Design a protein around this ligand. Structure first.
Ligand SMILES: CC(=O)N[C@@H]1[C@@H](O[C@@H]2O[C@H](CO)[C@H](O)[C@H](O[C@]3(C(=O)O)C[C@H](O)[C@@H](NC(C)=O)[C@H]([C@H](O)[C@H](O)CO)O3)[C@H]2O)[C@H](O)[C@@H](CO)O[C@H]1O
Ligand SMILES: *[C@@H]1O[C@H](CO)[C@@H](O[C@@H]2O[C@H](CO)[C@@H](O)[C@H](O)[C@H]2NC(C)=O)[C@H](O)[C@H]1NC(C)=O
Ligand SMILES: *[C@@H]1O[C@H](CO)[C@@H](O[C@@H]2O[C@H](CO)[C@@H](O)[C@H](O)[C@H]2NC(C)=O)[C@H](O)[C@H]1NC(C)=O
Ligand SMILES: *[C@@H]1O[C@H](CO)[C@@H](O)[C@H](O)[C@H]1NC(C)=O
Ligand SMILES: *[C@@H]1O[C@H](CO)[C@@H](O)[C@H](O)[C@H]1NC(C)=O
Ligand SMILES: *[C@@H]1O[C@H](CO)[C@@H](O)[C@H](O)[C@H]1NC(C)=O
Lengths: 321, 160
C-alpha cells in the first residue's frame, strides 16, 4: 500500500531553449514572437494612406503633370513612396534641403493646397510660355502645375515685386524656384535682362539667388536646370519676392495641418483595401504578441521589433516520457 | 534537474494526470489513481503567469526606428544614423533573447523545486507511518485507504 508524489506529462512537442541545454521538450510553452503580416498597405484605423505610386514628394508638391492624381490629396495616415519614383522633377534640377522637407512631412497628416498668387496676376509678364518638352502633358509641353515659369513680355522683364501675408491659421509651406539657363543668349531670349536675381524675404528669411550658368548634359532633353526653394511662412508673417528674371514664382502653397504623427514609408506595394492597427512596409500586423520580426520601420500600435527567428517562453515543465 | 526531483530521483512524469502540474498516485486495496494538487499547481500557475507578464512589460519601453533620408553628401550622418538604429535593435534583440533564455532556465527549476517541496511536505508528514522508497513513492506499513489517503492530501493527516 502506497502514495506517490509526481508531475504532469503529455504529448507536447513544444521546445524551449536555456543557457545550458537547447531544445528542451516541455509540457506547455507560450510563443511571444509574431512572424506574419498580411502583405498589404492598409488604412490605419480607418484612415487611408497617401500612396504616391510613380510620383515622388517633389513631383507631388511642385505639381509635375504626370502626377495630377495628387493635385489635392486628402488627410492621410502615413505616406508611401517608391524607392525611385520615375516622376519627380520633370524639368531637371535640384531641390534645396529636400530631405528636411521630407522629414517635415512626418510632423503632419495633411497638406491643404491654396492659391496665394493667381496665375492671372502677372499683367506685365508672360505667364503662358513657361512650358518645356521635359514636362509632357497631353502630348504637349507643360510644366509643374503649382508654380509658374514667367517669361519676358514685349521684350521686357520689368522688375517684379510681390508680397503675400499669411492670413491663415496654419503654417504655410511656400515653394518657388529660379532657372539656370544654358548660356547668356538663352538668358536674354527668355528674360531680356542679363544680370538677374530672385530675392526673398520673410521675418526669418533673407535670400538672393543669382542664376548660375553652365553647360551640362541633357536630362529629359534639357541642358537647363531648375533650383527649388521652400520656407515655412508663419501665420501673420509676410513673404517678399523681388526679381528681374529667371523667377519660378509660386501659385499654390500648402497650409500645414499638424495633426502630426506620420513619417514616410518605402514600398512598391499599392493599396490593399484593408484596415489595420499596425503597418509595416511589407504588410500589416494584427497580433497580440509582445514581439515581432517583420520590419523595424513600423507605424501604429505595434509589437516590439527584434531580429529573433524564434522566441518561446517555457510555461509548463520538462516533458518526460 | 537543479533540485533533483523532475527527471531525477523521480524518473518520469505521469502521462495520465491531465488535472495539473503536480500531484499524487495512491495505491491500496480499494484501488489506485492520480490526483493533482491544487494548492501547489495553482501557486505555480500564478507565479509563472506573472513572469510572462513581467517579461512582456519590461520589454514594452524599448527602442523604435524612424525613417530619415540623406543625400549623396551626407553619407557620414546617414551611416551614423544606420549605425545607431542597428545598434539599439541589436541591443534590444539581445535583451529579448537573453531574458527569455535566463528565465526559461529558472522556470524549469521552479517546477523541479516545486516538486521537491511537495514531495518534502509529504516525507516529513508521513513521518514513521510509511517507508521512503526513493522513487517518489511512500509505502506505509499498516494498511491505509482512501479515507486515509485523502488525509495526506487534505494536509490534515495524523490523529494529532
Ligand atoms: C525650334 C527648335 O525646336 N529648336 C531646336 C533646338 O531645340 C531647342 O533647344 C533649346 C536649347 O538651345 C531648348 O532646349 C528648347 O527646348 C525648350 C523646352 O524646354 O522644351 C523649348 C521651350 O519652349 C522653352 N521654354 C521656354 C519657357 O522658353 C525651353 C527653355 O527655353 C529652355 O529650357 C531654357 O533652359 O526650352 C529646344 O526646343 C535644337 O537644340 C537644335 C538642334 O537640333 O535645333 C533647333 O531647331
Ligand atoms: C499681415 O497682416 C496683418 C493684418 O491683417 C498684420 O497684423 C496686424 O497689424 C495691425 C496693424 O497694421 C495690428 O493692429 C494688428 O494687431 C495685427 N493683427 C494681428 C493678427 O496681429 C501683420 O503685421 C501683417 N504681416 C506683416 C508682417 O506684414
Ligand atoms: C479532511 O480531513 C478529514 C478529517 O477531519 C478527512 O476525513 C473525514 O472523516 C470524517 C469521519 O471521521 C468524515 O465524516 C468526513 O467526511 C471526512 N472529511 C471531512 C472532515 O469532511 C477528509 O478525508 C479530508 N479531506 C476531505 C475529503 O475533506
Ligand atoms: C495529444 O495526445 C493525445 C493522446 O494521449 C491525443 O488524443 C491528442 O489529440 C494529442 N494532441 C495532439 C498532438 O494534437
Ligand atoms: C533544435 O531542434 C530543431 C527542430 O526543429 C532543429 O531545427 C535545431 O537544429 C535543433 N537545435 C539543435 C540544438 O541542434
Ligand atoms: C484581428 O483578428 C481578430 C480575430 O479574428 C479579429 O477579431 C480582429 O478584428 C482582427 N483585427 C484586424 C485589424 O483585422
Amino acid at each position: 500500500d502506497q502514495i506517490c508524489i509526481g508531475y504532469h506529462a503529455n504529448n507536447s512537442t513544444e521546445q524551449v531553449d536555456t543557457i545550458m541545454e537547447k531544445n528542451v521538450t516541455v509540457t506547455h510553452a507560450q510563443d511571444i514572437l509574431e512572424k506574419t503580416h498580411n502583405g498589404k498597405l492598409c488604412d490605419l484605423n480607418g484612415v487611408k494612406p497617401l500612396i504616391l505610386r510613380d510620383c515622388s514628394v517633389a513631383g507631388w508638391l511642385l505639381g509635375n503633370p504626370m502626377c495630377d492624381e495628387f493635385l489635392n490629396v486628402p488627410e492621410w495616415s502615413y505616406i508611401v513612396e517608391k524607392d525611385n519614383p520615375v516622376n519627380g522633377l520633370c524639368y531637371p534640377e535640384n531641390f534645396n534641403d529636400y530631405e528636411e522637407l521630407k522629414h517635415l512631412l512626418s510632423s503632419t497628416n495633411h497638406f491643404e493646397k491654396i492659391r496665394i498668387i493667381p496665375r492671372s496676376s502677372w499683367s506685365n509678364h508672360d505667364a503662358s510660355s513657361g512650358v518645356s518638352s521635359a514636362c509632357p502633358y497631353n502630348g504637349r509641353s507643360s510644366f509643374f502645375r503649382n508654380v509658374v515659369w514667367l517669361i519676358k513680355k514685349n521684350n521686357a522683364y520689368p522688375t517684379i515685386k510681390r508680397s503675400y501675408n499669411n492670413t491663415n491659421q496654419e503654417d504655410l509651406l511656400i515653394l518657388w524656384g529660379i532657372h539656370h539657363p544654358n548660356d547668356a543668349a538663352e538668358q536674354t531670349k527668355l528674360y531680356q535682362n542679363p544680370t538677374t536675381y530672385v530675392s526673398v524675404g520673410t521675418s526669418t528669411l533673407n535670400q538672393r539667388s543669382v542664376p548660375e550658368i553652365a553647360t551640362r548634359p541633357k536630362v529629359n532633353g534639357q541642358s537647363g536646370r531648375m533650383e527649388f526653394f521652400w520656407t515655412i511662412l508663419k501665420p501673420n508673417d509676410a513673404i517678399n519676392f523681388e526679381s528681374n528674371g529667371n523667377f519660378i514664382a509660386p501659385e499654390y502653397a500648402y497650409k500645414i495641418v499638424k495633426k502630426g504623427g506620420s513619417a514616410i514609408m518605402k514600398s512598391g506595394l499599392e493599396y490593399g483595401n484593408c484596415n489595420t492597427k499596425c503597418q509595416t512596409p511589407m504588410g500589416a500586423i494584427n497580433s497580440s504578441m509582445p514581439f515581432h520580426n517583420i520590419h523595424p520601420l513600423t507605424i501604429g500600435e505595434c509589437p516590439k521589433y527584434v531580429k529573433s527567428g524564434r522566441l518561446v517562453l517555457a510555461t509548463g515543465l520538462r516533458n518526460v516520457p | 534537474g537543479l533540485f533533483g526531483a523532475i527527471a531525477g530521483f523521480i524518473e518520469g512524469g505521469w502521462q495520465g494526470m491531465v488535472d495539473g502540474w503536480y500531484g499524487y498516485h495512491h495505491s491500496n486495496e480499494q484501488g489506485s489513481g492520480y490526483a493533482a494538487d491544487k494548492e501547489s499547481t495553482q501557486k505555480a500557475i500564478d507565479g509563472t503567469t506573472n513572469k510572462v507578464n513581467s517579461i512582456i512589460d519590461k520589454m514594452n519601453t524599448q527602442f523604435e526606428a524612424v525613417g530619415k533620408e540623406f543625400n549623396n553628401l551626407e553619407r557620414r550622418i546617414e551611416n551614423l544614423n544606420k549605425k545607431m538604429e542597428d545598434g539599439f535593435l541589436d541591443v534590444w534583440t539581445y535583451n529579448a533573447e537573453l531574458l527569455v533564455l535566463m528565465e526559461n532556465e529558472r522556470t524549469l527549476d521552479f517546477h523541479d523545486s516545486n516538486v521537491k517541496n511537495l514531495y518534502d511536505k509529504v516525507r516529513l508528514q508521513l513521518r514513521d507511518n510509511a517507508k521512503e522508497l526513493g522513487n517518489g513513492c511512500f509505502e506505509f506499513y499498516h494498511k491505509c485507504d482512501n479515507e486515509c489517503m485523502e488525509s495526506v492530501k487534505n494536509g490534515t493527516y495524523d490523529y494529532p
